[PDB]
């Protein structure tokens, strides 16, 4: 058959599509609210009566923890074990993974125009990659090009212990550490990060913290109406890049470390002017070790469907 | 052919040996001061002499980063071409490998006397591996199992940031930062970083350090006579458990974390009764994570002998 169901579910969006066998290629993209519907199965139901096309593969990416055949939503009402929907549907095939697997699994699809580079010389063909980005948790993927094939790397990356270089950072870790117990790189990148970001930096004036939520960081920040704001926001982009550079070193990913979109889009042209580079090459001796590594933002409107699709081909046999 | 040449050349010292390449054995190995020969070629040609064994294939460890054609070590009188040395012996296939490399090759290899196990479940086949070692520096190194084959990822893990947790890991970095600047995880886990931890507690209490070495320091801690050397031998064998932690998260390496040789085995009794695995697993929400996760201790004598057989007899075809 030509087609395949491909997904991407994101809590309460559940966006599918058709994707080409034989080339990869995406068409038909569907996105419905999961508040209208019960469950997974029933709006992928109702997407293939409408559209009149015979699947029997499919690859659908879930923004949750996907280990065991029951899936559970983050905070979304849906739950579902995978052998009963593969069994419901008649499926010779369905594949679940995570939302950050797909979207390191798209990067081979991409070309440069869905790309924005910050700093850095050329991608080495062959090395490894790195994939993060900071969205209502830290998601962290890896890339590695092995005999043909793209073998995708996952692993709890965010929650590796938040590293302090600057003056700055230090009392924010003591602050946080006081609070919650380990602190993680997910408390200070993300959207609770950049809260977290805020209300530290307002305790360290001797003050108490203003109750509001990240989307109220970011256009106050962008405003210039509130000096904490734009400072948690600097401080955000600036703890990106060091956390990029870590990254760099530890695999040695000289194909490119790559940001998976996230709220960064929301502050675009000021992350562009931050010193997320600077702190991305502020290792010491080996600052001209990750000097030329590029770091591209992934500007693609899908790559979660992209990056189904190339993953579903490939476990069919296809090669990238 | 039966045998083929492999090596582990550091700084002073060329350890060559025969390798079986239908077993993976090292036999008849032997030990080479690089003062008393011109090149590495010349310490080949007299081993291959005086063992009259006719090898076609070779794989040398070498101790410094092998980024291309040329081969600049410490012993800048051995630089060399490997397009030249393989020319000149007249092998077909000589690879040149990091020393670090070749260790992670040898884990495949390993048997259960080589290994000291440290906490964690059984480690799950097929999932990568992290290997990392504290010698006179930080070596990491990643081992992915693809297509019945293993793949080796290098990188420079040992220099991204330092990351305190405890309060009194703050103040270290705090006291190193003054000095340095950028304090990676190489300045506190190795032999020079048990100088610069005991230089920051005796700093911290208002005091002046003494001019010692880091053999200095793990004798003083093993035998009770100093308190500031006890202490940093006490942080060190616990920021070498929040470091495996951390590799373990990034990469979901449950195939297990090794730890190669280096200056734990010369204090293994301290090391054992250290809070290194509960340091470990101090990954807040994601200590269950880490929990299953099993750590080894590597005892074997010549790791880099053994791995650089297994390196060549996977690039000869062989399955290890």
Same mark, same amino acid.
């Given at each position: 058959?030509?087609?395949?169901?491909?997904?991407?579910?994101?809590?309460?969006?559940?966006?599918?599509?058709?994707?080409?066998?034989?080339?990869?290629?995406?068409?038909?993209?569907?996105?419905?609210?999961?508040?209208?519907?019960?469950?997974?199965?029933?709006?992928?139901?109702?997407?293939?009566?409408?559209?009149?096309?015979?699947?029997?593969?499919?690859?659908?990416?879930?923004?949750?923890?996907?280990?065991?055949?029951?899936?559970?939503?983050?905070?979304?009402?849906?739950?579902?074990?995978?052998?009963?929907?593969?069994?419901?549907?008649?499926?010779?095939?369905?594949?679940?993974?995570?939302?950050?697997?797909?979207?390191?699994?798209?990067?081979?699809?991409?070309?440069?125009?869905?790309?924005?580079?910050?700093?850095?010389?050329?991608?080495?063909?062959?090395?490894? /990659?790195?994939?993060?980005? &900071?969205?209502?948790? =830290?998601?962290?993927?890896? *890339? @590695?090009?092995?005999?043909?094939?793209? $073998?995708?790397?996952?692993?709890?990356?965010?929650?590796?212990?938040?590293?302090?270089?600057?003056?700055?950072?230090?009392?924010?870790?003591?602050?946080?550490?006081?609070? /919650?117990?380990?602190?993680? &790189?997910?408390?200070? =990148?993300?959207?609770?990060? *950049? @809260?977290?970001?805020?209300?530290?930096? $307002?305790?360290?004036?001797?003050?108490?913290?203003?109750?509001?939520?990240?989307?109220?960081?970011?256009?106050?920040?962008?405003?210039?109406?509130?000096?904490?704001?734009?400072?948690?926001?600097?401080?955000?982009?600036?703890?990106?890049?060091?956390?990029?550079?870590?990254?760099?070193?530890?695999?040695?990913?000289?194909?490119?470390?790559?940001?998976?979109?996230?709220?960064?889009?929301?502050?675009?042209?000021?992350?562009?002017?931050?010193?997320?580079?600077?702190?991305?090459?502020?290792?010491?001796?080996?600052?001209?070790?990750?000097?030329?590594?590029?770091?591209?933002?992934?500007?693609?409107?899908?790559?979660?469907?992209?990056?189904?699709?190339?993953?579903?081909?490939?476990?069919?046999?296809?090669?990238?």
């Amino acid at each position: 058959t030509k087609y395949a169901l491909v997904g991407d579910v994101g809590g309460t969006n559940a966006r599918l599509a058709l994707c080409d066998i034989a080339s990869g290629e995406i068409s038909q993209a569907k996105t419905y609210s999961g508040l209208d519907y019960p469950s997974l199965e029933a709006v992928i139901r109702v997407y293939l009566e409408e559209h009149k096309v015979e699947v029997k593969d499919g690859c659908i990416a879930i923004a949750c923890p996907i280990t065991g055949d029951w899936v559970a939503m983050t905070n979304h009402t849906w739950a579902f074990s995978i052998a009963e929907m593969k069994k419901n549907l008649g499926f010779s095939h369905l594949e679940i993974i995570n939302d950050f697997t797909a979207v390191s699994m798209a990067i081979p699809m991409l070309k440069k125009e869905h790309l924005i580079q910050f700093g850095g010389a050329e991608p080495v063909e062959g090395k490894p /990659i790195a994939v993060y980005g &900071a969205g209502t948790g =830290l998601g962290v993927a890896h *890339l @590695v090009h092995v005999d043909k094939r793209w $073998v995708s790397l996952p692993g709890e990356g965010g929650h590796v212990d938040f590293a302090p270089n600057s003056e700055e950072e230090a009392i924010i870790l003591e602050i946080l550490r006081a609070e /919650i117990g380990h602190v993680s &790189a997910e408390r200070v =990148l993300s959207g609770p990060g *950049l @809260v977290n970001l805020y209300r530290a930096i $307002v305790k360290a004036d001797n003050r108490l913290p203003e109750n509001l939520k990240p989307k109220d960081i970011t256009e106050r920040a962008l405003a210039d109406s509130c000096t904490d704001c734009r400072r948690a926001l600097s401080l955000f982009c600036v703890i990106m890049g060091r956390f990029g550079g870590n990254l760099a070193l530890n695999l040695g990913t000289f194909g490119g470390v790559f940001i998976a979109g996230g709220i960064v889009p929301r502050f675009l042209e000021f992350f562009k002017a931050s010193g997320f580079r600077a702190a991305f090459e502020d290792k010491g001796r080996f600052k001209e070790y990750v000097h030329d590594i590029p770091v591209y933002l992934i500007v693609h409107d899908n790559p979660g469907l992209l990056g189904s699709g190339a993953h579903l081909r490939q476990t069919l046999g296809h090669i990238l």
